[PDB]
Structure 1
Amino acid sequence: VVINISGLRFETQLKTLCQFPETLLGDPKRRMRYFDPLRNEYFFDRNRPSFDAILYYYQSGGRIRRPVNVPIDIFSEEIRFYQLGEEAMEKFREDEGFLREEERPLPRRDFQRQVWLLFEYPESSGPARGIAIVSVLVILISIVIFCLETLPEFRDDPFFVVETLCIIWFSFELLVRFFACPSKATFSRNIMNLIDIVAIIPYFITLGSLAILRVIRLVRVFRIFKLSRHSKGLQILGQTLKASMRELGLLIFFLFIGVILFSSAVYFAEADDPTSGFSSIPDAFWWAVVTMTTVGYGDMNPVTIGGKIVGSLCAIAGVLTIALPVPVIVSNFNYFYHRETEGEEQSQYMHVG
């Protein structure tokens, strides 16, 4: 068969177009209105370079590309015009990277679907927005009273009666969601819900082993992580830290080679001095990590020229061990920034049509 896309002749076999017998070109009654019985061809008055990837979809047997010149709002119309189907439309989706939104879990009630739209979806309604302005205020007061409790003018109980205001309110915002979810096993895997409970598990022990009395106080600071729910930027931070496992491990490892190698070199170049502040290898560990990171503290300083040549080569190599696996992390942060701020806003406006 011969197809004439506004002047460009594409000519393929008939059994290639019969592989997909539900599309425009596969159905002999839908493409029959585009025939041209004077030249024995089908004439479409469409975009020229967009058909080079439509014909390759039939030839390869199912793959969908996108040519570089044609934009996404143009190529999303040719799949809609040639009637390739939603199977081929969704295969165009993840090829561009934009994954479709997952279906929310419906609990199938009217009391339960209302309270699900009341708290977990704060953007929808009025009292949905009413909790969100106080779910920032309840968190910020709890972190700052945890700071104000540690202030030593009071340490070195009205400070108990102000913190129970925030914690039963923390318990208020959890007991309204303990019974209001579609599922319960999926409740125990979502890390948004996984730390919230840990905030109460450390307080319920307090009303009813010194090392244990301190450990708990450390978990009380976890309440900072509750800000991740209603803050859009932290998920971009949360996904970048969670997609960069094997690159973050190389960041702390590449300096650990530089810690041991340079603490030994500053030691043996200053072992022949009684006034040397570096007593041993764990003594000069803090010097080796404060010079490679280019902070500097000045507690332990080399004095001789043999020890002033290793730290100068330590600070130079200290940049060249920490700035090497960094720029893949700032690119992953740019990916989750560009697939949340203008990723789906430009995709789903012309991907769902």
Structure 2
Amino acid sequence: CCERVVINISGLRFETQLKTLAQFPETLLGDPKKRMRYFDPLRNEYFFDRNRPSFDAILYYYQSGGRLRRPVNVPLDIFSEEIRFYELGEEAMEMFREDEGYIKEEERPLPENEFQRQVWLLFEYPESSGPARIIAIVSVMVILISIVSFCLETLPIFRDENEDMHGGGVTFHTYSQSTIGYQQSTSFTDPFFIVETLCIIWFSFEFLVRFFACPSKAGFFTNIMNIIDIVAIIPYYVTIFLTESNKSVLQFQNVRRVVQIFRIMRILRIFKLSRHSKGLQILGQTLKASMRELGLLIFFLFIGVILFSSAVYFAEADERDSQFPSIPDAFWWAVVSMTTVGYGDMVPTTIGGKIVGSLCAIAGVLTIALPVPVIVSNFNYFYHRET
């Protein structure tokens, strides 16, 4: 109880009470059978020829009762080899790394089929083999092929080479060539409509095979990089069900631009690269670690837009020739001028509207730049977090 224990770490003395070290009986300093081999009987002390600045954090682990932390001048490779010597446990080591942030609990469980397991690693880890890389090399090239095929449909070398090459009317079958961007047929004479179709065969045979061989079946749809897989393949099928099921009149009066919405939503197939790029996931995590502080930006900009769109609207009010007809006209202008893009479509003209307009140039710097280095410090942190 009152017995004081002198621990000598390479010439540095650390006297402690015996009931402090005996608080933790399974460590090297808590078990008397373990620390028996370090006792110097001529000096009545425990001599450890070990690192010197590491032990003040090891000593205060016992005094505070379990609160250890790394000293500022002791690196992570030196100090982690001291926790393993002093035997502070597998339990107080995990509390140490989480404070540190060296928290990598990734353990890929296989599907357990032993070929359902074996084929799973062929489609989850490119690093297992040469051909494991090849699928990743394929599927990265796959997405690009769809994109160029998607973008070229819009080109007026080819959308002017449509079924309505002159553009006079609108047919129910020409709705696909003008608002779905390809001509669906069992003959499939549309070349892009083939090339569009080819990639979807790859994506499902990625996905469905990845669905049947997943270990976790229920939490499959909480993983975000599986959601993008699903949203990719759908407007393909929405294209076909409009063609296959519908043999009727007056469908455009129900939903026609709703179809044109879907022709956009194809565009988020580009996010499928997230499974392959390490760097794109770091953006995916930086935003995941900034969803409140990003909201500082938008809300500070929403303040900035309204305050100056109005204030320029009334200094540009008394014109018959004003470039600013309303205030939600001037929401376009403010974001052209707080973000300092600056177009020239509409610019203030009056003497007051310039004085208002010039404050808004400064204030957009003072609105973007407040929560930007909040973000970029996270991104820099999440980038090198692999090291």
TM-score band, normalised by the shorter chain? over 0.9
1:140-179 aligned at under 5 Å gives the runs 140-156=144-160, 157-179=190-212
Q: Distance in 2 between matches of 1:254 and 1:64?
A: 41
1:17-56: CA deviation from partner (whole Å, max 9, x where unpaired): 1111111111112211111112211111112211111111
Structure 2 residue aligned with 1:247, among 293, 304, 322?
A: 293
Residue 350 of structure 1 is matched in structure 2 by: none
Q: Distance in 2 between matches of 1:259 and 1:281?
A: 10
Is 2:366 aligned against 1:320? yes
Structure 2 residue aligned with 1:181, among 205, 214, 219?
A: 214
- Give the root-mean-square deviation of aligned CA atoms: 1.4
| Identical-pair percentage | 86
Query: What stretches of structure 2 of length at least 5 have no aligned partner?
Result: 161-189, 242-254
Is 2:263 aligned against 1:217? yes
Give the CA deviation at 1:143.
1.1
Q: Distance in 1 between matches of 2:78 and 2:233?
A: 53
Give the CA deviation at 1:136.
0.9
Q: Distance in 1 between matches of 2:191 and 2:79?
A: 66
Give the CA deviation at 1:254.
1.0
Residue 36 of structure 2 is matched in structure 1 by: 32
Is 2:61 aligned against 1:50? no
Structure 2 residue aligned with 1:121, among 121, 125, 129?
A: 125
Is 2:99 aligned against 1:66? no
1:96-135: CA deviation from partner (whole Å, max 9, x where unpaired): 1110333223332211110111110111112211101101
1:1-353 aligned at under 5 Å gives the runs 1-156=5-160, 157-208=190-241, 209-340=255-386, 342=387
Q: Distance in 2 between matches of 1:135 and 1:60?
A: 54
Deviates more, 1:110-119 or 1:153-162: 153-162
Query: Any idea what SS the aligned residue of 2:292 has?
Result: helix
Q: Distance in 2 between matches of 1:77 and 1:159?
A: 60
Q: Distance in 2 between matches of 1:146 and 1:107?
A: 36
Q: Check whether the contact 1:122–1:131 (CA below 8 A) recurs between aligned residues.
A: yes
Deviates more, 1:283-292 or 1:148-157: 148-157
Q: Check whether the contact 1:5–1:47 (CA below 8 A) recurs between aligned residues.
A: yes
1:145-203: CA deviation from partner (whole Å, max 9, x where unpaired): 11111223322322212221111122221222121111211211111111212222211
Shift >3 Å, 4+ stretches: none
Q: Check whether the contact 2:110–2:120 (CA below 8 A) recurs between aligned residues.
A: no
1:291-347: CA deviation from partner (whole Å, max 9, x where unpaired): 11111111212222221111111101121112111110001101101202x1xxxxx
Query: Any idea what SS the aligned residue of 2:218 has?
Result: coil
Q: Check whether the contact 1:93–1:100 (CA below 8 A) recurs between aligned residues.
A: no
1:198-253: CA deviation from partner (whole Å, max 9, x where unpaired): 22221112122102211211111111010110111001100011111111112111
Query: Any idea what SS the aligned residue of 2:122 has?
Result: coil
Q: Check whether the contact 2:6–2:44 (CA below 8 A) recurs between aligned residues.
A: yes
Residue identity in the other structure for 1:286: W
Q: Check whether the contact 2:146–2:195 (CA below 8 A) recurs between aligned residues.
A: no
Across the two proteins, how many residue pairs are aligned to each other? 341
Q: Distance in 1 between matches of 2:342 and 2:306?
A: 18
**TM value normalised by structure 2:** 0.85
Q: Check whether the contact 1:105–1:182 (CA below 8 A) recurs between aligned residues.
A: yes
RCO (CA 8 Å, sep 6+): is it higher in 1 or 2?
A: 1
Q: Check whether the contact 1:236–1:333 (CA below 8 A) recurs between aligned residues.
A: yes
Q: Distance in 1 between matches of 2:194 and 2:326?
A: 50
**TM value normalised by structure 1:** 0.93
Residue identity in the other structure for 2:128: S
Q: Distance in 1 between matches of 2:221 and 2:318?
A: 60
Query: Any idea what SS the aligned residue of 2:258 has?
Result: helix
Residue identity in the other structure for 1:2: V
